[PDB]
Design a protein around this ligand. Structure first.
Ligand SMILES: Nc1ncnc2c1ncn2[C@@H]1O[C@H](COP(=O)(O)OP(=O)(O)OP(=O)(O)O)[C@@H](O)[C@H]1O
Ligand SMILES: [Mg+2]
Length: 260
């Protein structure tokens, strides 16, 4: 089937429905090819999302909705939220309230760098299998324990880049290699990026890591002259709407549910 999407849908309708196999998925939107019901993000297949859109398209709201979807699908022992918000976006991650779920929220660039590096080096790197092990030894290793870590990164274009005099690494760069290997350490990065400059957007290292990780990418409002791939062009769209594009090339028009 292929139905047309409403102007708006409440995220609470989406959550109450998913609630009612061996699922490892969250849902924060409805889809044209899902009979206007929830579109599950299968986290074993696509452990995160890259979200690309022009101003006003609903990048920030989508992360709020994803946060709320996480909290309704998982207990705090199963999932923790790390909130990265360099623009202190109005009505954004700063207002997502959940004690027990939020292990860190930061907006200051050095603070963000600290939070991401601590998570990557103290928590996630240990979950990787040690180097210099036989494949036989690797197959019998104990799996890591603890919660899955959902890192919500708004406005990656506003993260401070690498510099010299004084030397500083790009803010949050510690996470990039673990994002490629995210399926092994239970890391789930949902990052948004302004995409008015379609031509630099592929050079953004956050986009590179997510593409290299082969996560799905959500193309919200964009210039229809721009091409997602040989077969799919970007679309101009109202807020909350986007083209969900899998690494396999599958494409769905979706509508992000409006958060509580
Ligand atoms: N899922 C949605 N459904 C309906 N309307 C939405 C949705 N998300 C956002 N909007 C509308 O779009 C407006 C801007 O949303 P938001 O601030 O999330 O966009 P943004 O892309 O993060 O903006 P910016 O590019 O300025 O950071 C909201 O105030 C709301 O009016
Ligand atoms: Mg925003």
């Amino acid at each position: 089937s292929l139905q047309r999407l409403p102007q708006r849908v409440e995220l609470s309708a989406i959550v109450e429905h998913e609630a009612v196999g061996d699922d490892l998925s969250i849902a924060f939107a409805i889809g044209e090819r899902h009979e206007l019901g929830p579109v599950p993000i299968k986290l074993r297949e696509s452990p995160g999302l890259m979200i690309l859109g022009r101003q006003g398209c609903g990048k920030t709201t989508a992360l709020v909705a994803i946060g709320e979807a996480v909290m309704n699908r998982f207990s705090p022992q199963q999932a923790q939220l790390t909130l990265i918000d360099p623009k202190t976006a109005p009505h954004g991650l700063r207002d997502l309230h959940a004690p027990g779920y939020v292990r860190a929220y930061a907006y200051d660039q050095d603070e963000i760098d600290e939070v991401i590096t601590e998570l990557a080096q103290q928590i996630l790197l240990p979950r990787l299998p040690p180097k210099g092990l036989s494949q036989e030894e690797l197959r019998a290793l104990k799996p890591w324990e603890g919660p899955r870590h959902f890192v919500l990164i708004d406005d990656v274009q506003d993260l401070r880049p690498a510099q010299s005099y004084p030397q500083k690494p790009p803010v949050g760069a510690a996470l990039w290699k673990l994002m490629e290997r995210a399926r092994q350490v239970g890391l789930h990065v949902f990052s948004t990026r302004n995409s008015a400059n379609w031509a630099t957007m592929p050079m953004d290292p956050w986009v590179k890591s997510q593409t290299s990780a082969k996560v799905a990418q959500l193309y919200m409002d964009n210039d229809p002259q721009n091409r997602i791939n040989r077969s799919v062009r970007a679309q101009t769209l109202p807020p909350g709407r986007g083209l969900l594009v899998g690494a396999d090339g599958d494409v769905e028009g979706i509508l992000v549910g409006y958060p509580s």
